[PDB]
Amino acid sequence: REVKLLLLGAGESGKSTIVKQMKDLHFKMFDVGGRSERKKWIHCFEGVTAIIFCVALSDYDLVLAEDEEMNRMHESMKLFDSICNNKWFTDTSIILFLNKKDLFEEKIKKSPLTICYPEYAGSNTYEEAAAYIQCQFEDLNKRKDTKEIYTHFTCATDTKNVQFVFDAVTDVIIKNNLKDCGLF
Amino acid sequence: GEFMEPRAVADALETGEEDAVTEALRSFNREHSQSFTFDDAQQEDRKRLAKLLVSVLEQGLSPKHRVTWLQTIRILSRDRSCLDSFASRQSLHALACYADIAISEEPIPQPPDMDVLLESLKCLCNLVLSSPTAQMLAAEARLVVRLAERVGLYRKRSYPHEVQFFDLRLLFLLTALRTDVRQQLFQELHGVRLLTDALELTLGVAPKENPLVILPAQETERAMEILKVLFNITFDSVKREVDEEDAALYRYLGTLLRHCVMADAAGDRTEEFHGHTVNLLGNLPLKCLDVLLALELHEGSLEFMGVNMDVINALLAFLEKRLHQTHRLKECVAPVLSVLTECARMHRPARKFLKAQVLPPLRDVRTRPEVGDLLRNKLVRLMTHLDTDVKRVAAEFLFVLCSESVPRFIKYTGYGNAAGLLAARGLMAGGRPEGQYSEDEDTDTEEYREAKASINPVTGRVEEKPPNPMEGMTEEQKEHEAMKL
């Protein structure tokens, strides 16, 4: 009774990772994008949760620049406006996968977030930049009464039996001890 | 003048009348006593005074009234600008031998006046907090050995607690900055042993294990800095495979450590004590963390299965006191969830009290998840926080508390709230409740939750049915395929 893994994504840019990571209740593998017709897509579902496209947080400056037309994250917002605000998904829920945090964190210490838009006003940390991106993606939808939406900033780490990648919480508490201690 | 600048003592020190220049020092330091700020229009005068003072330092100091020069180099050391006029070789070594913490430049030492030890330890920690080349040199000049010897060796001594406080703070400031200092303190010194002996002498574990919940105020401070440096030693050198000679002192550290969570501090420090104690409990080895669910039992708190669990109820009360702060969560409620996870992940009969405290039999009221004000509605809302570590520890805390099953997890929390955890490591079609965990079918609820399509399979309670007032005109979503690529 895993009801709806309506999966999609920007295929070989972040979504190769999600199609590699999606292998009383059981679940099927179905409908990654195929090119079926309306006789097969009459009801894609009964109005149940679509696990949303990947947003790799790295196409925000990696523009699909055939004419430097638009960065691909704004195209992602456009197709999100197509997907989420359809009347055929009236009472649904939407699970955001903000994917590939690592190079986003690597690039916030680089060329700033003017590449999204100059409406951005955060102080170029990871936290407020990701908060702004979450804020744009959530308030791109407006009604939120019958459709509640859940956002997930994943890391796409190697989740195996090694916790050297778990150093970040220890660095945070060490640096917080360093900031909290002062001269006297 | 009367409250003169460093410019006046600059042309006053060249007329080196000793009582007059110590009068100038003793009138300067009381004016600028504890002010952490300064003026900027006299900056090169302060730099030249610093050069003159380290000329006096590296040439050697007076027999008596040296505490005046120590007080002035402390009160000038608090400036941000005069770091490079202090961080030299012979200056640091002079401050070390007046601090009696150097490896060389030492006789069989005179019985030290503690005043110059306070001022010299203050000078050392001020000098290492700024000026990173002084940190590199204090690593290079090998200062940690006499510090470790001193903190180990007042098992039988009588020092003022300010001395031990600033000494431990210097040890912490060294170990928080140079990886060579912490790798020297952990392995080739085995300082965990002696620092835990200092932890005992701060605590004073005895029969009557805390009916007197007050712990003294200064002792909470030095024990707090002890817990700081003890976390600072073993954070990266954790070994998931250990031996009995290694892990025996670890288990002893745990057995004395369980006393720390129970008691209360003075003032409002009782939050900060646990706020570093649980951090120390974070990186301890998993196979010998089982003293929480194995302490002594008596008639104080009601137990669950042969063993008291009042430390776990104290951990849950600390979690409820520590959750609704929302400013800096990744440093406050990450190790608590990690400790409760690795407490519950290894032996069963603690997870039953944990389950009874965090997963009551759900009445399934007309509220959703994450909309109420309780434990479940706080932390499953926390499950989609924008920090990776808080989600990674809270979703694992609720994946262990559901005994690692694909049902009985979304039944309590919601696929819409835990699909990220399931996408991380959960979908394998392997069916792992780890065998030994309590396979009870009786998870039928109090108000007897309705059928599998009545409740939301991704969210909580019954809300409505979809109206769908439409006919014809299908196949709208056709834009994503040519832009995915």
Side-chain angles (χ1 to χ4, degrees), chain B residues 223-289 291-376 378-433:
Chain B
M224 167 67 181
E225 308 213 313
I226 275 286
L227 296 196
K228 278 181 176 175
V229 59
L230 208 64
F231 176 69
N232 213 314
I233 289 175
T234 173
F235 71 94
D236 58 43
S237 85
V238 58
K239 308 304 169 195
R240 313 296 169 168
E241 162 72 24
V242 282
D243 59 76
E244 78 277 15
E245 303 169 351
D246 191 280
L249 55 89
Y250 269 104
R251 199 178 303 153
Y252 179 53
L253 158 67
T255 51
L256 57 90
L257 197 46
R258 260 71 164 172
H259 199 100
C260 318
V261 198
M262 267 302 163
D264 286 21
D268 286 10
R269 308 304 302 265
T270 183
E271 166 52 55
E272 205 183 1
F273 196 85
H274 305 90
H276 282 49
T277 316
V278 179
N279 307 336
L280 206 149
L281 280 167
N283 54 337
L284 298 190
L286 316 176
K287 84 189 86 159
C288 290
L289 180 46
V291 197
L292 293 158
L293 70 161
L295 285 177
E296 209 268 350
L297 74 161
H298 75 96
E299 308 92 357
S301 90
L302 276 180
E303 69 99 19
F304 209 94
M305 286 307 149
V307 57
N308 201 327
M309 291 197 48
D310 197 26
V311 286
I312 305 297
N313 212 326
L315 263 292
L316 266 300
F318 177 69
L319 194 77
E320 306 271 28
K321 203 181 173 303
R322 207 56 193 275
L323 200 42
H324 58 282
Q325 279 203 0
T326 199
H327 182 79
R328 48 179 188 175
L329 295 174
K330 194 170 75 173
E331 65 168 80
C332 299
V333 290
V336 189
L337 302 180
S338 199
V339 157
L340 298 192
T341 288
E342 309 290 86
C343 183
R345 218 193 205 187
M346 55 86 60
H347 202 183
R348 50 172 299 251
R351 92 174 43 199
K352 262 302 291 174
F353 182 51
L354 286 168
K355 158 93 186 47
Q357 285 302 317
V358 78
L359 264 58
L362 61 154
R363 303 212 307 232
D364 196 12
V365 285
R366 300 271 152 155
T367 76
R368 222 161 46 225
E370 75 95 27
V371 305
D373 291 322
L374 268 191
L375 195 39
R376 66 176 296 251
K378 266 161 195 305
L379 63 94
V380 303
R381 181 186 47 191
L382 191 70
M383 206 177 307
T384 174
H385 196 265
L386 73 154
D387 267 325
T388 304
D389 303 331
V390 192
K391 155 175 54 198
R392 200 51 165 84
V393 76
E396 280 266 359
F397 172 61
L398 275 66
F399 185 76
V400 160
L401 260 293
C402 77
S403 51
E404 310 193 343
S405 68
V406 192
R408 215 168 44 238
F409 184 43
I410 55 153
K411 184 147 287 298
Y412 204 85
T413 52
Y415 203 101
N417 275 345
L421 176 69
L422 184 76
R425 67 190 208 84
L427 75 169
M428 79 288 286
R432 188 90 282 191

Side-chain angles (χ1 to χ4, degrees), chain A residues 152-159 162-165:
Chain A
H152 279 160
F153 298 95
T154 176
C155 173
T157 178
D158 42 352
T159 77
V162 57
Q163 295 299 101
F164 164 67
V165 297

Side-chain angles (χ1 to χ4, degrees), chain B residues 114-128:
Chain B
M114 295 326 177
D115 301 272
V116 312
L117 291 191
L118 309 169
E119 309 317 304
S120 62
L121 266 295
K122 279 161 151 180
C123 277
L124 261 295
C125 57
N126 280 261
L127 260 295
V128 186

